[PDB]
Ligand SMILES: CC(=O)N[C@H]1[C@@H](OP(=O)(O)OP(=O)(O)OC[C@H]2O[C@@H](n3ccc(=O)[nH]c3=O)[C@H](O)[C@@H]2O)O[C@H](CO)[C@@H](O)[C@@H]1O[C@H](C)C(=O)N[C@@H](C)C(=O)O
Ligand SMILES: CC(=O)Nc1ccc(Sc2ccc3nnc(N)n3n2)cc1
């Protein structure tokens with residue numbers, strides 16, 4: 001791709017938009033940037049020579065563009081962006097720009113839950129083999145910052161939003177880990193529209209890796225599969241990872257636990273195998289990886305109480321993965337809240353029966369979450385209020401679990417800030 005002389009407009013003054021500004025400037029193109037937010041987080045990090053427009057989309061700029069670069073946070077269905085598409089103005093995202101420049105194979109990972117774990121695992125498998133690997137995308141390091149002529153393999157976590165604006169991805173190995181309701185505020189044609197965006201990841205992929213236990217991960221119309229009791233990669237119950245009936249790893253050697261993390265390990269191994277990484281070093285990486293911050297992270301274990309930061313549980317399916325099979329000796333104090341993105345929370349209710357569960361519900365959708373079981377629920381405005389309410393009630397044997405089933409953007413800079421604030425309060429209140 002050659003952008004010289006083009007009128008380039010970037011939508012979004014967040015992490016993605018700033019990475020795109022740097023990308024174009026380094027290639028001799030001065031873009032313009034807009035964002036519907038009046039004071040977006042990148043407003044003061046923008047180079048002084050770059051024109052900026054905030055508080056709305058600027059149709060004068062969009063309709064004059066040769067190329068529109070849309071951050072994943074702007075809907076293609078926004079009327080101004082849809083009008084530009086109607087006029088035949090090219091619209092891409094940062095992942096598209098990346099794919100046009102990358103010169104190493106790409107492993108591409110999407111799904112409603114498990115993405116960052118699988119992405120990081122494949123990266124660790126590559127590192128264990130001595131491969132120069134770049135890991136990024138939706139996990140938090142903008143993909144354009146990975147571009148490096150010495151890179152031998154890229155591992156990208158991709159969201160449905162990023163996939164909507166991507167056309168040139170030809171992954172060496174691609175997966176949809178699972179499909180459960182999320183981002184319904186962005187998908188007015190519902191679950192199948194969200195699924196269709198994720199299904200784009202398989203187009204022109206050399207190997208597709210599907211979840212044998214989740215039919216929505218399969219192309220609508222020759223894929224490798226992983227699953228619990230079936231699949232090319234599957235579990236054998238002590239629990240083993242197996243490939244086509246052959247034991248490859250006793251999961252006692254992993255640091256992660258839980259069935260969903262064992263299938264994450266299977267998916268990572270299937271992708272690593274498809275990318276040509278040596279099996280021995282891939283298996284080694286499964287035994288060294290300890291987990292990610294904010295993903296079912298024990299931030300304090302003291303006086304018989306475990307305080308668990310699962311702030312990365314931004315949808316119902318992720319909270320379900322925390323709750324399904326969860327063992328608690330005493331009472332579970334569960335923190336739910338934030339921006340639910342129009343999700344139906346009712347699938348959580350089957351985990352919330354019995355005498356040993358208390359709900360502390362906060363943020364934009366706190367009332368809807370407390371309605372799951374009002375007789376054991378309290379509602380506050382903020383997470384801090386919820387923590388100060390529950391802490392006097394905690395007894396040895398209890399668990400305090402932040403697994404909020406919602407996005408954090410109504411009250412926090414990012415889910416990391418939500419998790420960090422939870423950890424600070426847990427240390428104050430629990431020690
Ligand atoms: C919403 C989203 O896709 N966020 C990803 C994005 O971060 P970035 O800061 O660039 O986001 P953005 O595109 O500026 O959008 C951020 C927020 O601003 C809003 N926004 C954005 C542009 C605009 O004109 N108006 C507006 O209101 C968006 O709706 C959203 O609420 O790019 C980063 C690098 O690729 C990702 O790590 C990050 O994943 C975050 C963690 C996320 O929540 N992703 C979603 C998809 C998920 O995991 O479910
Ligand atoms: C249908 C099919 O066979 N798809 C495919 C996808 C990826 C690869 S690996 C690779 C290596 C360098 C490179 N540079 N750009 C890109 N997309 N790649 N991909 C092989 C085949």
Ligand SMILES: CC(=O)Nc1ccc(Sc2ccc3nnc(N)n3n2)cc1
Pocket residue numbers: 189192193196
């Ligand atoms: C079996 C099934 O459910 N297939 C399906 C596939 C895609 C969609 S998404 C869609 C559908 C219509 C439409 N009209 N305008 C827009 N933007 N859309 N989007 C939904 C269902």
Ligand SMILES: [Cl-]
Pocket residue numbers: 314407408409414415
């Ligand atoms: Cl968030």
